[PDB]
Ligand binder design. Structure first.
Ligand SMILES: CC[C@H](C)[C@H](N)C(=O)O
Ligand SMILES: CC[C@H](C)[C@H](N)C(=O)O
Ligand SMILES: CC[C@H](C)[C@H](N)C(=O)O
Ligand SMILES: CC[C@H](C)[C@H](N)C(=O)O
Ligand SMILES: CC[C@H](C)[C@H](N)C(=O)O
Ligand SMILES: CC[C@H](C)[C@H](N)C(=O)O
Ligand SMILES: CC[C@H](C)[C@H](N)C(=O)O
Ligand SMILES: CC[C@H](C)[C@H](N)C(=O)O
Lengths: 229, 229, 251, 230
């Protein structure tokens, strides 16, 4: 674990294999979560995205995640250049998803890694934000991130957990870049729970998702953000 | 009066000159209120702000403002993206301030304007919230709003009464905007009781206050909010 | 079906009658007998299990009842103005019962958490409240000329082999609130107790009856005594009985 | 000695104060003027045979100027007053004759001083000195009782109960002090004008319902002086 957190601290990003999360979980348990993605509602701003958001609060010397009843999501336009600057109302992440043992195990593993970093002030309240996202595609309409290309997120540390990737889906390559003129890493998450942690040090992106097949394809992910108040 | 309420209804905001409030009030009476600003305590969340809050309740077919003994102030993260989502404890607005004839005259003029709008449901309880705010600035630390930039407030109608603006103060320009990519109105309150009404239709902000003179400066305002339960 | 609608016997295996019952049937039974069993049919008719399961999970977040008993809860109340259908959520949350009714924790005001808006605003919850409201209106159990308080108690009885859970108050009682609806939301298969009792006196028991399937309901008027037998469990991982009370009373 | 009563109050959460301490200088004729104002009081909306007025003063942090609040709404949370709490009650205002009368003013300042020798309110902040002129009015068919009816605590951390009159054929109006709702430590009945009882939130208190033998009616007239923050 500290290996990945060290790599993250120096490079500003870290690939984390599914091993590290799946070690303790059957595929059937992970598949239950995968199915929740079918119920997600459309992202207002579009892009073929289907979302939920829920955040927990971590009081300074506490391990009790306290679920925030408010759901509005905001990023400044200084980071998210597409949909930033305004508050977005998404649905809440189903309790099935939130409370599922896998989800909870992933959150605490992320929390521990996050604690081995100075990426947030642990003296103050920490917001553990979760984004359940499906990029949904059909040959006529592809899907892409908000924002679309290389960016940084407001949240100093973001974990990208893959949950599913349809075998006839293209794109969804993650990019790591030190500037907007050059790309250091291309890397594509394909198997469930393959993860990528991202610090503000670098730029990151996700290549737009598309599909050959007319019946559609999808890329399902879970973001786990860490930030202060 | 209906002039300003009409302008407000169409444009989503309205400049109201001091005349409309100082109508028969001497400057000495307005100056008494100005001095109360020196006693305000620091806003917990900072930004060089010094505050009090008090709210009144208006029962449906009543003109009796009934002072609420509870003082906690909340805005959803859906509107106030900085300090929203949590309840803030401020001091209460001094009785001197609340009961002063000027203050009371301003509240009732606001109430009347507000009643000529559909911005709140007058069938239900209406919360008339008051925020006495000093933006205080010193060469090391300027002052700014919560939230910092363009936003909407939970409260459908907000009146911004200026009480003082130090001759060596910069910023405190109010901005009116249809989106976060464009600004339609810039407008700066400078003379006591110059007012600006704000509906949820538009985005508004206040440009950070700072100072030309090394001795520092301040911008003192009274907000009068209108909202339902 | 030879058994009546509100009849506790409807909750007996091979004693059910078919189809949804009309509301007024149960309200009539309630008016005469002072209680009424209402099958999940009457509420679940229009609700998927997935929708009901969302609500079930909210029970995991409930905080401990100060007075204990393995209970975890929230409380929120709405107000119904005399000629209104607008439920207006009360910002005050203190819960009180006189010791003349609740002999354990009565006589003092209890501060609970508020019922999450997820729970309150959920379509199922709202549908149940309005069905209860309608039934309640067909009774003289409250004065509809005056303000009516529609109180909601989200309660989990949580149990482990070492520590069982029980009601406040513990045994047969009446509640201050003239009409109380008991909606079951979940009952873990290895939970014991949670039998509801109906009694005309404290020396005799007329009905024993156990809610097990989600949204199985029991309405209770002040006419009778009622109880809930303590919940316990065989299994060391715990069990639970999750309910929603919907009270009706005047100001 | 004043500090004696304030010390007793601080430790026990309540204190009996004899009429001596207030009547010391004031003639009975002066006290009787105030007593008569009770005949004009209007019915408490919520009932219970009560007849009321309310007025409150504000005490700025470093000030001895009581500033009369022109607003009159009275509120207690349901967390304390389990009967009529949770809503704002509109009562009449206490007549200026009553408020400004030297007796009344002397009582308020003596209460203020006692109150200041306690931590029962934050004197750094504004203090609300609330006054309730109350008549419990009774006839054999309809008795009178407090809001709330039985043992309770009030929102206001310190409450002074001054008796002004008690008709000789009036029963009840015993004040109770209790550590819980299962037990009663003190029973105590105010009968002579200006006999007082101070009450802190530490304990539970009640007033046993007032009733009467006589068909022409009887009454118990009191003045409450509350202290609380804002
Ligand atoms: C943490 C990533 C966030 C959610 C992303 N930039 C978005 O707003 O869609
Ligand atoms: C802004 C982060 C994005 C959404 C994430 N890295 C993804 O692969 O979809
Ligand atoms: C109604 C305006 C409020 C007070 C402002 N957005 C703040 O939170 O400071
Ligand atoms: C959010 C409203 C702000 C506080 C107000 N318009 C001002 O000028 O400061
Ligand atoms: C109306 C039932 C109430 C809520 C029950 N006596 C309790 O205190 O839990
Ligand atoms: C006091 C009523 C109780 C709480 C309810 N009948 C139950 O089944 O638990
Ligand atoms: C301070 C006591 C108050 C006045 C009392 N509980 C009432 O509501 O009447
Ligand atoms: C709640 C305070 C009551 C009314 C007062 N102590 C009395 O004896 O009358």
């Amino acid at each position: 674990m500290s290996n990945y957190a060290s790599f993250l601290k120096e490079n500003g990003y870290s690939y984390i294999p599914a091993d590290f999360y799946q070690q303790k979980n059957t595929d059937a348990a992970v598949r239950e979560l995968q199915l929740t993605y079918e119920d997600l509602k459309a992202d207002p701003k579009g892009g073929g995205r289907y979302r939920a958001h829920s955040r927990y609060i971590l009081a300074p010397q506490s391990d009790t995640l306290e679920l925030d009843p408010d759901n509005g999501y905001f990023q400044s336009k200084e980071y998210n250049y597409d949909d930033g600057g305004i508050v977005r109302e998404f649905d809440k992440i189903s309790n099935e998803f939130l409370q599922h043992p896998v989800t909870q195990q992933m959150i605490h593993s992320n929390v521990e890694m996050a604690r081995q970093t100075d990426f947030v002030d642990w003296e103050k309240e920490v917001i553990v934000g979760l984004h359940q996202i499906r990029y949904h595609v059909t040959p006529d309409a592809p899907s892409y991130s908000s924002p679309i290309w290389l960016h940084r997120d407001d949240e100093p540390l973001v974990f990208v957990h893959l949950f599913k990737l349809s075998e006839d889906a293209i794109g969804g390559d993650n990019l790591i870049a030190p500037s907007v003129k050059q790309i250091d890493k291309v890397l594509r998450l394909t198997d469930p729970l393959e993860t990528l942690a991202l610090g503000q040090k670098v730029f990151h992106a996700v290549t737009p998702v598309g599909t050959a097949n007319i019946d559609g394809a999808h890329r399902d992910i879970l973001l786990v953000t860490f930030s202060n108040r």
